[PDB]
Design a protein around this nucleic acid. Structure first.
Lengths: 244, 244
DNA sequence: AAAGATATCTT
DNA sequence: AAAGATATCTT
């Protein structure tokens, strides 16, 4: 399927290539910084061609946001089925060592999930799937990346800004957690687990209906949450109480 | 000076070179995206080697943040003048048509400007200067040809995501304005003006002390600013009455 | 964890 | 404009 072909291409492209810099029109190469700010941008751009290739093979149109600050990164759809849209978002996080637990910010919980047309390319109700491409890289110990420029023949001299990169494709709901991913920018939080758990889809929600209801009624602060719910267990008690 | 040389090199490099995409170790080139998240990253990486070169020429050490959530992008200083550090932050914004009015977000007003060691590489009182390297680009919409990978031989064929990049070098306080640059993330707002206004330093503050006093006492919301001050005229009246 | 930092944009 | 969106990290 589209999903299995995209997953396979992602693992293979990741297995084969390693990004190492930005290239100017003159052939001058500038090395990459070591933080997520740089690497999320790079992983996003890296995936573009792959997604586009696999989508075309399945007959899906690929559309990126025309407005900045609009989810998702890629919108896949066939023209004959406008309400069967697939949303693909690319997320990145790091590890200091290969086998440590990670977590992702999975998007706002107050935008398009509470308001159908808020901060989204197409109305939220036209999407039948919300996929997360997650990239997890192990930080290089070095905190002083190259401050010089390179030419095309020196490509293999350019320090790689990561020790290793891992990638996965998974439904948003499946890897969603019950603790916010951010405070002032109110983001859904993912589970806090090993890479394996994301691939395997070992979440905490019983279903997507439950994930969306949880995040749609989650209060923004501790104070407001303390009289309602702060976690999945409290939420299920809240349901039993009659949503009050 | 360090400042004249730095700006001369940035300005020279800007007018001769153009970034095209990310390159891998295997030689595959990946086109760039058309938005500020991508372009801010690129312009940061593009500027790194220039800053290091000019800094080295004046005997200055260049230090980048060891922690991710830390200002500034670059800390310049001679070991003989530890308390005369120079902070450099690179900011980017866009324009839809060459030479429209622009504005930047100039860092928080609730971190290092109110707390000496909050979110800053070195105590704020060790810096005698805070410079902004500002990049302005004219946005260009993505087309089919940016969705595929390119080889080194097609470098010049890759479609650029921007048009007419402009760059300036100025003190933070000089281009600082009197309205917040953002709400929930509480940033100082720059003046809202043409590119030449930034270069020439046509800001609203009369001194750096006034800049700092204004932003140190600026309330976070409209409700709280209603009784204090919302702009420079109100601030100066507040000052005239005795800070009340 | 919760809350608020990092940079910038939209409505 | 003010307010809260876009992604992610720190503490």
């Amino acid at each position: 399927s589209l999903r299995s072909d995209l997953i396979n291409a992602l693992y293979d492209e990741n297995q084969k290539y390693d990004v190492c810099g930005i290239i100017s029109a003159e052939g001058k190469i500038y090395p990459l910084g070591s933080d997520t700010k740089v690497l999320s941008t790079i992983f996003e751009l890296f995936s573009r061609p792959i997604i586009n290739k696999i989508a075309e093979k399945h007959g899906y149109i690929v559309e990126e946001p025309k407005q900045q600050n609009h989810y998702p990164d890629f919108t896949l759809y066939k023209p004959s089925e406008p309400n069967k849209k697939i949303a693909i978002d690319i997320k990145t996080t790091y590890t200091n060592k290969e086998n440590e637990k990670i977590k992702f910010t999975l998007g706002g919980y107050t935008s398009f999930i509470r308001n159908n047309t808020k901060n989204i390319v197409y109305p939220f109700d036209q999407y039948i799937a919300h996929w997360i491409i997650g990239y997890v890289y192990t930080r290089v110990a070095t905190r002083k990346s190259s401050l010089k420029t390179y030419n095309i023949n020196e490509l293999n001299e350019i320090p790689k800004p990561y020790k290793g990169v891992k990638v996965f494709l998974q439904d948003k709901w499946v890897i969603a957690g019950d603790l916010a991913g951010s405070g002032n920018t109110t983001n859904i939080g993912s589970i806090h687990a090993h890479y394996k758990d994301f691939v395997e889809g070992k979440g905490i929600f019983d279903s997507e209906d439950e994930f969306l209801d949880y995040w749609r009624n989650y209060e923004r602060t501790s104070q407001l949450r303390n009289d309602k719910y702060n976690n999945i267990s409290e939420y299920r008690n809240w349901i039993y109480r009659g949503r009050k």
